[PDB]
Amino acid sequence: GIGALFLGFLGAAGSKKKNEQELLELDKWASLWN
Numbered sequence: 001g002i003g004a005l006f007l008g009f010l011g012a013a014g015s016k017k018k019n020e021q022e023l024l025e026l027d028k029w030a031s032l033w034n
Contacts, residue, residue, distance in 0.1 A: 015022060016029060 009025075012022075013025060013029070016025060
């Protein structure tokens with residue numbers, strides 16, 4: 001499910017701000033800006 005996948009994504013959203021690879025979510029959430 002898209003909701004299940006997303007829900008499980010929030011779990012990794014806790015580390016929003018080790019590896020720059022996380023930046024993925026950084027620009028994903030920051031994307032809100034633009």
